[PDB]
Coordinates of C-alpha atoms and ligand atoms in Angstrom, one line a residue:
Chain A
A13 CA -21.8 50.9 23.8
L14 CA -22.7 48.9 20.7
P15 CA -24.3 45.6 21.9
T16 CA -22.3 42.4 21.5
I17 CA -24.2 39.5 19.8
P18 CA -22.9 35.9 20.3
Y19 CA -22.5 34.2 16.9
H20 CA -24.3 31.2 18.4
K21 CA -27.6 33.2 18.4
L22 CA -27.5 33.3 14.5
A23 CA -28.8 30.4 12.4
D24 CA -29.9 29.7 8.8
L25 CA -27.1 31.7 7.2
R26 CA -27.8 32.5 3.5
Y27 CA -25.5 34.3 1.1
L28 CA -26.6 37.9 0.2
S29 CA -23.5 39.5 -1.3
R30 CA -19.8 39.0 -1.6
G31 CA -17.8 42.2 -1.7
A32 CA -14.1 43.1 -1.1
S33 CA -14.7 44.4 2.4
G34 CA -16.7 41.2 3.5
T35 CA -19.4 38.7 2.9
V36 CA -23.0 39.6 3.8
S37 CA -25.5 36.8 4.8
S38 CA -29.0 36.8 6.2
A39 CA -29.5 35.0 9.4
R40 CA -32.2 34.3 12.0
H41 CA -31.7 35.5 15.6
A42 CA -32.7 32.7 18.0
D43 CA -34.0 35.1 20.7
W44 CA -35.5 37.9 18.7
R45 CA -37.2 35.6 16.1
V46 CA -36.4 38.0 13.3
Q47 CA -34.1 38.0 10.3
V48 CA -30.9 40.0 10.5
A49 CA -28.0 40.6 8.2
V50 CA -24.3 40.0 9.1
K51 CA -21.3 41.3 7.3
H52 CA -18.3 39.0 7.8
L53 CA -15.3 41.4 7.8
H54 CA -12.6 39.4 6.0
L60 CA -4.6 39.8 16.0
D61 CA -5.3 42.3 18.8
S62 CA -4.2 45.2 16.6
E63 CA -6.9 44.4 14.0
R64 CA -9.6 43.7 16.6
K65 CA -9.0 47.0 18.4
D66 CA -9.1 48.8 15.0
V67 CA -12.3 47.0 13.9
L68 CA -14.2 47.7 17.1
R69 CA -13.3 51.4 16.9
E70 CA -14.4 51.6 13.3
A71 CA -17.7 50.0 14.1
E72 CA -18.4 52.2 17.2
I73 CA -18.0 55.2 14.9
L74 CA -20.8 53.8 12.8
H75 CA -22.9 53.4 16.0
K76 CA -23.3 57.2 16.2
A77 CA -25.4 57.2 13.0
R78 CA -29.0 56.8 14.0
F79 CA -31.6 57.9 11.5
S80 CA -34.6 56.4 9.7
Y81 CA -32.8 56.4 6.3
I82 CA -29.6 54.8 7.6
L83 CA -29.3 51.0 8.0
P84 CA -29.6 50.4 11.8
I85 CA -26.6 48.5 13.3
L86 CA -28.0 46.1 15.9
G87 CA -24.7 44.9 17.3
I88 CA -21.2 43.3 16.7
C89 CA -20.2 39.7 16.7
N90 CA -16.9 39.6 18.5
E91 CA -15.9 36.0 18.0
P92 CA -12.3 34.7 18.3
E93 CA -11.7 34.1 14.6
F94 CA -14.6 36.1 13.3
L95 CA -15.6 39.7 13.3
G96 CA -19.2 40.6 12.2
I97 CA -21.5 43.6 12.0
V98 CA -25.2 42.8 12.5
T99 CA -27.9 45.0 11.0
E100 CA -31.6 44.9 10.3
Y101 CA -32.4 42.7 7.3
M102 CA -33.8 44.6 4.3
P103 CA -36.3 42.3 2.7
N104 CA -36.4 44.1 -0.7
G105 CA -32.6 44.2 -1.2
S106 CA -30.7 46.9 -3.0
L107 CA -31.7 49.8 -5.3
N108 CA -29.5 48.1 -7.9
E109 CA -31.8 45.1 -8.0
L110 CA -34.9 47.2 -8.3
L111 CA -33.6 49.3 -11.1
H112 CA -32.1 46.5 -13.2
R113 CA -34.3 43.5 -12.6
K114 CA -36.9 44.2 -15.3
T115 CA -38.7 40.9 -15.4
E116 CA -39.3 41.2 -11.6
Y117 CA -40.0 45.0 -11.8
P118 CA -41.2 45.9 -15.3
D119 CA -42.5 49.3 -14.0
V120 CA -41.3 51.5 -11.2
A121 CA -43.8 54.4 -10.8
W122 CA -42.3 57.9 -10.7
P123 CA -43.6 58.7 -7.2
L124 CA -41.7 55.8 -5.8
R125 CA -38.5 56.7 -7.7
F126 CA -38.6 60.3 -6.4
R127 CA -39.4 59.1 -2.8
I128 CA -36.2 56.9 -3.1
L129 CA -34.2 59.9 -4.3
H130 CA -35.6 62.1 -1.5
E131 CA -34.8 59.5 1.2
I132 CA -31.3 58.9 -0.1
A133 CA -30.6 62.6 0.1
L134 CA -32.1 62.9 3.6
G135 CA -29.9 60.0 4.7
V136 CA -26.7 61.5 3.2
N137 CA -27.6 64.9 4.5
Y138 CA -27.8 63.4 8.0
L139 CA -24.4 61.8 7.6
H140 CA -23.0 65.2 6.5
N141 CA -24.4 66.9 9.6
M142 CA -22.8 64.5 12.0
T143 CA -20.0 65.8 14.2
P144 CA -17.5 64.6 13.1
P145 CA -18.6 63.5 9.6
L146 CA -17.8 60.1 8.1
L147 CA -14.2 60.1 6.7
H148 CA -15.0 57.5 4.0
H149 CA -17.6 57.6 1.2
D150 CA -18.7 54.9 -1.2
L151 CA -22.3 55.6 -2.1
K152 CA -23.6 53.2 -4.8
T153 CA -26.8 51.5 -5.8
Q154 CA -25.5 48.3 -4.2
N155 CA -25.4 49.8 -0.7
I156 CA -28.8 51.6 -0.9
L157 CA -31.3 49.1 0.6
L158 CA -35.0 48.8 0.5
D159 CA -37.2 47.8 3.4
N160 CA -40.5 46.0 3.3
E161 CA -42.4 49.1 2.3
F162 CA -39.6 50.1 -0.2
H163 CA -38.3 52.9 2.0
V164 CA -34.6 53.6 1.8
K165 CA -31.9 52.6 4.3
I166 CA -28.4 53.5 3.1
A167 CA -25.4 51.4 4.2
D168 CA -22.7 53.7 2.7
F169 CA -20.4 53.4 5.8
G170 CA -16.6 53.6 5.6
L171 CA -16.6 49.8 5.2
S172 CA -16.2 49.7 1.4
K173 CA -12.9 51.7 1.5
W174 CA -11.6 50.0 4.7
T193 CA -16.7 49.7 -9.1
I194 CA -15.7 53.3 -10.0
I195 CA -18.8 54.6 -11.9
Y196 CA -20.0 56.5 -8.7
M197 CA -16.6 57.9 -7.9
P198 CA -15.7 61.5 -8.8
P199 CA -12.6 62.0 -11.0
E200 CA -10.6 63.9 -8.3
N201 CA -10.7 60.7 -6.2
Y202 CA -9.0 58.5 -8.8
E203 CA -5.6 59.7 -7.5
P204 CA -6.0 59.1 -3.8
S211 CA -13.4 66.9 -0.2
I212 CA -17.0 67.3 1.0
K213 CA -18.2 67.0 -2.6
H214 CA -17.7 63.2 -3.1
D215 CA -21.2 62.0 -2.2
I216 CA -23.1 64.5 -4.4
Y217 CA -21.2 63.2 -7.4
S218 CA -22.2 59.7 -6.5
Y219 CA -25.8 60.9 -6.0
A220 CA -25.9 62.6 -9.4
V221 CA -24.9 59.3 -11.1
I222 CA -27.4 57.4 -8.9
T223 CA -30.1 59.9 -9.8
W224 CA -29.4 59.4 -13.5
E225 CA -29.5 55.6 -13.0
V226 CA -32.8 55.9 -11.1
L227 CA -34.5 58.0 -13.8
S228 CA -33.0 56.0 -16.8
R229 CA -32.9 52.4 -15.3
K230 CA -29.8 52.1 -17.5
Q231 CA -26.2 51.0 -16.7
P232 CA -24.0 54.2 -16.6
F233 CA -21.3 53.9 -19.3
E234 CA -23.0 50.7 -20.6
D235 CA -21.1 50.7 -23.9
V236 CA -17.6 51.0 -22.2
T237 CA -16.5 47.6 -20.9
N238 CA -13.0 48.5 -19.6
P239 CA -13.3 50.3 -16.2
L240 CA -10.0 52.1 -17.0
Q241 CA -11.6 53.5 -20.2
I242 CA -14.5 54.8 -18.0
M243 CA -11.9 56.5 -15.7
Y244 CA -10.1 58.2 -18.6
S245 CA -13.4 59.4 -20.2
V246 CA -14.7 60.7 -16.8
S247 CA -11.5 62.5 -16.0
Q248 CA -11.9 64.4 -19.3
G249 CA -15.4 65.5 -18.4
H250 CA -17.5 62.7 -20.0
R251 CA -20.6 61.5 -18.1
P252 CA -23.5 59.1 -18.6
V253 CA -25.6 60.2 -21.7
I254 CA -28.4 62.7 -21.3
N255 CA -30.9 62.7 -24.2
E256 CA -34.4 61.8 -25.2
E257 CA -33.6 58.1 -25.1
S258 CA -31.7 57.8 -21.8
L259 CA -34.0 60.1 -19.8
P260 CA -37.7 59.7 -21.0
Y261 CA -39.9 62.8 -21.8
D262 CA -42.3 61.9 -19.0
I263 CA -39.9 62.3 -16.1
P264 CA -41.6 64.8 -13.7
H265 CA -39.7 68.2 -13.7
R266 CA -37.4 66.6 -16.3
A267 CA -35.5 69.8 -17.1
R268 CA -34.8 70.7 -13.4
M269 CA -33.8 67.1 -12.7
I270 CA -31.3 67.1 -15.6
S271 CA -30.0 70.4 -14.4
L272 CA -29.6 69.0 -10.8
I273 CA -27.8 65.9 -12.2
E274 CA -25.4 67.9 -14.3
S275 CA -24.6 70.2 -11.4
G276 CA -24.1 67.3 -9.0
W277 CA -21.5 65.6 -11.3
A278 CA -19.7 68.8 -12.3
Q279 CA -16.0 68.4 -13.1
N280 CA -15.2 71.2 -10.7
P281 CA -16.1 70.0 -7.1
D282 CA -16.9 73.6 -6.1
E283 CA -19.7 73.9 -8.7
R284 CA -21.5 70.9 -7.1
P285 CA -24.5 71.6 -4.8
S286 CA -24.7 70.7 -1.1
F287 CA -27.3 68.1 -0.1
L288 CA -29.2 70.9 1.5
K289 CA -29.6 72.5 -1.9
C290 CA -30.7 69.1 -3.4
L291 CA -33.4 68.7 -0.7
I292 CA -34.6 72.3 -1.5
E293 CA -34.9 71.4 -5.2
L294 CA -36.6 68.0 -4.5
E295 CA -39.2 68.9 -1.9
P296 CA -41.3 70.8 -4.4
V297 CA -41.2 67.8 -6.8
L298 CA -42.4 65.4 -4.1
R299 CA -45.3 67.7 -3.2
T300 CA -46.8 67.0 -6.6
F301 CA -47.6 63.4 -5.4
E302 CA -50.3 62.6 -2.9
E303 CA -49.3 60.2 0.0
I304 CA -51.6 57.5 -1.3
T305 CA -49.9 57.4 -4.7
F306 CA -46.7 56.2 -3.0
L307 CA -48.6 53.3 -1.4
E308 CA -50.3 52.5 -4.7
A309 CA -46.9 52.5 -6.4
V310 CA -45.5 50.0 -3.8
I311 CA -48.6 47.8 -4.0
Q312 CA -48.5 47.7 -7.8
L313 CA -44.8 46.7 -7.6
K314 CA -45.7 43.8 -5.2
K315 CA -48.8 42.7 -7.2
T316 CA -47.0 42.6 -10.6
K317 CA -44.1 40.8 -9.0
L318 CA -46.5 38.0 -8.0
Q319 CA -47.2 37.4 -11.7
Chain B
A13 CA -23.2 58.8 24.0
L14 CA -26.8 59.7 23.1
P15 CA -26.6 62.8 20.7
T16 CA -27.4 66.2 22.2
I17 CA -29.8 68.3 20.1
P18 CA -29.9 72.1 20.7
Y19 CA -33.6 73.1 21.4
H20 CA -33.1 75.9 18.8
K21 CA -32.8 73.3 16.0
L22 CA -36.5 72.4 16.6
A23 CA -39.2 74.6 15.1
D24 CA -42.9 74.8 14.4
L25 CA -43.9 72.9 17.5
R26 CA -47.4 71.5 17.3
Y27 CA -49.3 69.8 20.2
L28 CA -49.7 66.0 20.0
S29 CA -50.4 64.8 23.5
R30 CA -50.5 66.1 27.1
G31 CA -49.8 63.4 29.8
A32 CA -48.7 63.5 33.4
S33 CA -45.1 62.6 32.3
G34 CA -44.9 65.5 29.8
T35 CA -46.1 67.3 26.7
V36 CA -45.4 65.8 23.3
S37 CA -45.1 68.0 20.2
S38 CA -44.2 67.5 16.6
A39 CA -41.4 69.7 15.4
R40 CA -39.2 70.2 12.3
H41 CA -35.5 69.6 12.8
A42 CA -33.8 72.5 11.0
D43 CA -30.7 70.5 9.7
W44 CA -32.3 67.1 9.0
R45 CA -35.4 68.6 7.3
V46 CA -37.7 66.0 8.7
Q47 CA -40.5 65.9 11.3
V48 CA -39.5 64.7 14.8
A49 CA -41.3 64.4 18.1
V50 CA -40.2 66.0 21.4
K51 CA -41.4 65.1 24.9
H52 CA -41.1 68.0 27.3
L53 CA -40.4 66.2 30.6
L60 CA -31.3 70.4 39.9
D61 CA -28.2 68.5 38.7
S62 CA -29.1 65.3 40.5
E63 CA -32.4 65.0 38.6
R64 CA -30.8 66.0 35.2
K65 CA -28.1 63.4 35.6
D66 CA -30.7 60.7 36.5
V67 CA -32.9 61.7 33.5
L68 CA -29.8 61.4 31.2
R69 CA -28.8 58.0 32.6
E70 CA -32.4 56.8 32.1
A71 CA -32.4 57.9 28.5
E72 CA -29.0 56.6 27.6
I73 CA -30.1 53.1 28.8
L74 CA -33.0 53.4 26.3
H75 CA -30.4 54.2 23.6
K76 CA -29.1 50.6 23.7
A77 CA -32.5 49.4 22.5
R78 CA -32.3 49.2 18.7
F79 CA -35.0 47.2 17.0
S80 CA -37.5 47.8 14.2
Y81 CA -40.5 47.7 16.6
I82 CA -39.1 50.1 19.2
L83 CA -39.4 53.9 18.7
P84 CA -35.8 55.2 18.0
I85 CA -34.6 58.0 20.3
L86 CA -32.7 60.5 18.1
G87 CA -31.3 62.6 20.9
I88 CA -31.8 64.6 24.1
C89 CA -32.5 68.3 24.4
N90 CA -30.1 69.1 27.3
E91 CA -31.2 72.6 28.2
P92 CA -30.6 74.3 31.6
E93 CA -34.3 74.5 32.6
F94 CA -35.7 72.1 30.0
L95 CA -35.2 68.4 29.4
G96 CA -36.5 66.8 26.3
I97 CA -36.4 63.5 24.5
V98 CA -36.5 63.6 20.7
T99 CA -37.7 60.6 18.6
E100 CA -38.8 59.8 15.1
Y101 CA -42.2 61.2 14.3
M102 CA -44.9 58.6 13.9
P103 CA -47.3 60.0 11.3
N104 CA -50.3 57.8 12.3
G105 CA -50.1 58.4 16.0
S106 CA -51.1 55.9 18.7
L107 CA -52.9 52.5 18.7
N108 CA -55.4 54.1 21.1
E109 CA -56.4 56.7 18.4
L110 CA -56.8 53.9 15.7
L111 CA -58.9 51.7 18.0
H112 CA -61.3 54.3 19.4
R113 CA -61.7 57.0 16.7
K114 CA -64.4 55.1 14.8
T115 CA -65.7 57.9 12.6
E116 CA -62.2 58.4 11.3
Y117 CA -61.5 54.6 11.2
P118 CA -64.8 52.7 10.8
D119 CA -62.9 49.6 9.7
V120 CA -59.6 48.2 10.8
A121 CA -59.3 44.9 8.9
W122 CA -58.4 41.8 11.0
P123 CA -55.0 41.2 9.2
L124 CA -53.8 44.6 10.2
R125 CA -54.9 44.1 13.8
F126 CA -53.0 40.8 14.1
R127 CA -50.0 42.4 12.5
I128 CA -50.1 45.1 15.1
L129 CA -50.4 42.4 17.9
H130 CA -47.5 40.4 16.4
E131 CA -45.2 43.5 16.1
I132 CA -46.0 44.6 19.7
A133 CA -45.1 41.2 21.0
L134 CA -41.8 41.1 18.9
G135 CA -40.9 44.5 20.3
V136 CA -41.6 43.6 23.9
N137 CA -39.8 40.2 23.4
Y138 CA -36.8 42.2 22.3
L139 CA -36.9 44.4 25.4
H140 CA -37.2 41.3 27.6
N141 CA -34.1 39.8 26.0
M142 CA -31.9 42.8 26.6
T143 CA -29.0 42.5 29.1
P144 CA -29.9 43.8 31.5
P145 CA -33.8 43.9 30.9
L146 CA -35.7 47.1 31.4
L147 CA -36.5 48.0 35.1
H148 CA -39.6 50.0 34.2
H149 CA -42.7 48.9 32.5
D150 CA -45.7 51.0 31.3
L151 CA -47.1 49.3 28.2
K152 CA -50.4 50.9 27.0
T153 CA -52.3 51.7 23.8
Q154 CA -51.1 55.4 24.1
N155 CA -47.4 54.5 23.8
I156 CA -47.8 52.0 21.0
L157 CA -47.3 54.2 17.9
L158 CA -48.0 53.7 14.2
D159 CA -45.7 54.7 11.3
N160 CA -46.7 55.8 7.8
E161 CA -47.6 52.2 6.8
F162 CA -49.1 51.3 10.2
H163 CA -46.2 49.3 11.5
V164 CA -45.7 49.4 15.2
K165 CA -43.1 51.3 17.2
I166 CA -43.4 50.9 21.0
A167 CA -42.3 53.8 23.3
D168 CA -42.9 51.9 26.6
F169 CA -39.6 53.1 28.1
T193 CA -54.3 55.2 33.2
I194 CA -54.5 52.0 35.3
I195 CA -56.4 49.6 33.1
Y196 CA -53.1 48.1 31.8
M197 CA -51.7 47.6 35.4
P198 CA -51.7 44.1 36.9
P199 CA -53.4 43.6 40.3
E200 CA -50.2 43.0 42.2
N201 CA -49.2 46.6 41.5
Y202 CA -51.8 47.9 44.0
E203 CA -52.1 45.1 46.6
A210 CA -44.3 40.3 39.2
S211 CA -41.7 42.7 37.9
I212 CA -41.1 40.3 35.0
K213 CA -44.8 39.5 34.5
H214 CA -46.1 43.1 34.2
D215 CA -45.9 43.6 30.4
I216 CA -47.8 40.4 29.5
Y217 CA -50.7 41.5 31.7
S218 CA -50.8 44.9 29.9
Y219 CA -50.5 43.0 26.5
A220 CA -53.5 40.8 27.4
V221 CA -55.6 43.9 28.0
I222 CA -54.3 45.6 24.9
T223 CA -55.1 42.4 22.9
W224 CA -58.6 42.4 24.3
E225 CA -58.9 46.1 23.4
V226 CA -57.6 45.5 19.8
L227 CA -60.0 42.7 19.1
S228 CA -63.0 44.5 20.7
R229 CA -62.3 48.1 20.0
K230 CA -64.1 48.7 23.3
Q231 CA -62.8 50.7 26.3
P232 CA -61.8 48.2 29.1
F233 CA -64.1 48.7 32.1
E234 CA -66.1 51.3 30.2
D235 CA -69.1 51.0 32.6
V236 CA -67.0 51.6 35.7
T237 CA -66.4 55.4 36.3
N238 CA -64.6 55.3 39.7
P239 CA -60.9 54.3 39.2
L240 CA -61.0 52.9 42.7
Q241 CA -63.7 50.5 41.6
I242 CA -61.5 49.4 38.6
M243 CA -58.5 48.8 40.9
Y244 CA -60.6 47.0 43.5
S245 CA -62.4 44.8 40.9
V246 CA -59.1 43.9 39.2
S247 CA -57.4 43.0 42.6
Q248 CA -60.3 40.6 43.2
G249 CA -59.9 38.9 39.8
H250 CA -62.3 40.8 37.6
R251 CA -61.2 41.5 34.1
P252 CA -62.7 43.1 30.9
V253 CA -65.8 41.1 29.8
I254 CA -65.4 38.2 27.3
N255 CA -68.7 37.3 25.5
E256 CA -70.6 37.6 22.2
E257 CA -70.9 41.4 22.7
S258 CA -67.3 42.3 23.5
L259 CA -65.5 39.8 21.2
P260 CA -67.8 38.9 18.2
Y261 CA -67.9 35.3 16.9
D262 CA -66.3 36.4 13.5
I263 CA -62.9 37.2 15.1
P264 CA -60.3 35.0 13.3
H265 CA -58.8 32.4 15.7
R266 CA -61.2 33.7 18.4
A267 CA -60.6 30.7 20.6
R268 CA -56.8 30.9 20.5
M269 CA -56.9 34.6 21.1
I270 CA -59.3 34.4 24.1
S271 CA -57.0 31.6 25.5
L272 CA -54.0 33.9 25.2
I273 CA -55.8 36.9 26.7
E274 CA -57.0 34.9 29.7
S275 CA -53.5 33.4 30.3
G276 CA -51.9 36.8 29.9
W277 CA -54.0 38.6 32.6
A278 CA -54.0 35.6 35.0
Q279 CA -54.3 36.7 38.7
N280 CA -51.3 34.6 39.6
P281 CA -48.2 36.2 37.8
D282 CA -46.6 32.7 37.5
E283 CA -49.5 31.5 35.3
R284 CA -48.8 34.2 32.8
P285 CA -46.9 33.2 29.6
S286 CA -43.6 34.6 28.4
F287 CA -43.7 36.7 25.2
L288 CA -41.8 33.9 23.5
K289 CA -44.9 31.7 24.1
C290 CA -47.1 34.5 22.7
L291 CA -45.0 34.6 19.6
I292 CA -45.2 30.8 19.2
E293 CA -49.0 31.1 19.4
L294 CA -49.2 34.1 17.0
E295 CA -46.9 33.0 14.2
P296 CA -49.3 30.3 12.9
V297 CA -52.2 32.9 12.9
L298 CA -50.1 35.5 11.0
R299 CA -49.2 32.8 8.4
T300 CA -52.8 32.6 7.3
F301 CA -52.6 36.2 5.8
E302 CA -50.9 36.9 2.5
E303 CA -48.5 39.9 2.6
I304 CA -50.6 41.8 0.1
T305 CA -53.7 41.7 2.3
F306 CA -51.9 43.8 4.9
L307 CA -51.1 46.5 2.3
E308 CA -54.7 46.4 1.0
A309 CA -55.9 46.8 4.6
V310 CA -53.7 49.9 5.1
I311 CA -54.7 51.4 1.7
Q312 CA -58.4 50.8 2.5
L313 CA -57.9 52.4 5.9
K314 CA -56.4 55.5 4.3
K315 CA -59.1 55.7 1.6
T316 CA -62.1 55.3 4.0
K317 CA -60.4 57.9 6.3
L318 CA -61.0 60.5 3.5
Ligands
LIG1 C1 -31.6 37.1 -1.2 C2 -32.6 38.1 -0.6 N1 -32.7 39.3 -1.4 C3 -33.5 39.0 -2.7 C4 -33.7 40.2 -3.6 C5 -33.3 40.4 -0.7 C6 -32.6 40.9 0.6 O1 -31.3 41.4 0.2 C7 -30.5 42.0 1.0 C8 -30.8 42.4 2.3 C9 -29.9 43.1 3.1 N2 -30.3 43.4 4.4 C10 -29.4 44.1 5.1 N3 -28.1 44.4 4.7 C11 -27.7 44.1 3.5 N4 -26.5 44.5 3.1 C12 -25.5 45.0 4.0 C13 -25.3 44.6 5.3 C14 -24.4 45.2 6.1 O2 -24.1 44.8 7.3 C15 -24.6 43.6 7.8 C16 -23.7 46.3 5.6 CL1 -22.5 47.1 6.6 C17 -23.9 46.8 4.3 C18 -24.9 46.2 3.5 CL2 -25.1 46.8 1.9 C19 -28.6 43.4 2.6 C20 -28.3 43.0 1.3 C21 -29.2 42.3 0.5 O3 -29.1 41.9 -0.8 C22 -27.9 42.3 -1.5
LIG2 C1 -54.1 62.2 15.7 C2 -52.8 63.0 15.6 N1 -52.0 62.7 14.4 C3 -51.5 63.9 13.7 C4 -51.1 65.1 14.5 C5 -51.0 61.6 14.7 C6 -49.6 62.0 15.2 O1 -49.6 61.7 16.6 C7 -48.5 61.3 17.3 C8 -47.2 61.2 16.8 C9 -46.1 60.9 17.6 N2 -44.9 60.7 17.0 C10 -43.9 60.4 17.9 N3 -44.0 60.2 19.2 C11 -45.2 60.3 19.8 N4 -45.3 60.1 21.1 C12 -44.2 60.0 22.1 C13 -43.1 60.7 21.9 C14 -42.0 60.5 22.8 O2 -40.9 61.3 22.8 C15 -40.7 62.2 21.8 C16 -42.2 59.6 23.9 CL1 -40.9 59.4 25.0 C17 -43.3 58.8 24.0 C18 -44.3 59.0 23.1 CL2 -45.7 58.0 23.2 C19 -46.3 60.7 19.0 C20 -47.6 60.8 19.5 C21 -48.7 61.1 18.8 O3 -50.0 61.3 19.3 C22 -51.0 61.9 18.5

């Protein structure tokens, strides 16, 4: 069902990312005259398995999920083709502080809202996705800084977003990841920044330690600061059963987003783009 | 396999439009907690309506309205799509109290995106068999980016009431004229038969100092494109590829920030 795209239609390949599951490059489609992204997934048994995996992802169609435009089924080369997200990843927005000295709260909360809507959609699919690897690197930002999430199985097929019960390989995985991401969005800090050995992070986390919550990490002027802190701490609870559903997150978040007028979101985006021009 | 959506999942229906093809309402999806739009359209007809909609499911592109699912009820068929908060191109062009200004950069962006969207549909394998492009089914998202839902007779080429592959460019030429003029094509003519007859004899919306002011950017190129697009002879009409070639230079003359300023100024004035 998912359209096949001849590799010969793609030109001007440029590196975007290099992960374990595959390389991602931007490319220009000859016929469509737009940019796309292609993930180069690093035998007939493998080809059959890779098509089935990608056709599962084809079911996901929602405004906050990265659209898959087709598959490159080449002889030596398998590739997933998606929309190109001009503004890159949430990780880049949060941590590139020369480029983005300020990120206005309304935009940050819009991002959080859209992430949760996207994951909520994935959780309501029948069946749900079996694999989960939500992180700031696979939350992408379109031309108007709206979210499209690309947390497909592909990552499984960094440990800071992974809940401790997953260290020894539940419907409570994504909310844990989201709580860390929320913390990261509100702080613009690296989770566990002091700790440099990932194994030390894993040990600490397994014993109930989490990214730091205080007046320094999470500024006083966070809207609904105390409710957000409460949401974060519930989301990354040691006990998976204590963690809220994404439904419950959305219920908590919708009030917060009502405090911003629609025009302030656009002003936040335009101020991002203006400052970035220097 | 286009997803089925139980009708009971949609709530708080509000009227958006009433056409011959069906009623369209906004609704809230209970599980997804977002706004959607639903078009309220025998087993032979139900199967044919599903087949038609599953063909549209293949089309995935930024400038094409996504179909999210089908309401497959016994007595009720319904297509569900994303909700487009800013409605149709027709509303933007013609509601001049609401929208006294629509800055040129925004108008050209709309034209560019329409052409990219139709170009996409024309490159599908196979291409779409049915064609009904009009300002009413060109929709505008929250930041006034286009999504076309082309899955009135002023957009119809003369050979329709006397070619298959030259229909959309004819409609696009009229739409282009309408975007640049903000006038109703054939506004003076009140009998639809007179429009059809006039068009069949080679008459078109008027091109002069009144319809298309001298201050339109790239006025000469745009007029050239319009007149080629609605040529009497279907063979003389350009491909959408050729439109895109002509348009890309024009769109390069605007900085990306001017588009956003145009949208914000639209929303401010609208208050
Ligand atoms: C260099 C330009 N930079 C500057 C800041 C901006 C543009 O950067 C990105 C655009 C992307 N567009 C779409 N997809 C991406 N990734 C991806 C693709 C997938 O399939 C194909 C899957 Cl399955 C998953 C992902 Cl995450 C993107 C990643 C990007 O930068 C990391
Ligand atoms: C001025 C009114 N305001 C606020 C109330 C702007 C909102 O207006 C609209 C939003 C729409 N959102 C999505 N789809 C539409 N239409 C449509 C849907 C289809 O299936 C579901 C098909 Cl198959 C085709 C179409 Cl055209 C829409 C049409 C609209 O008109 C007014």
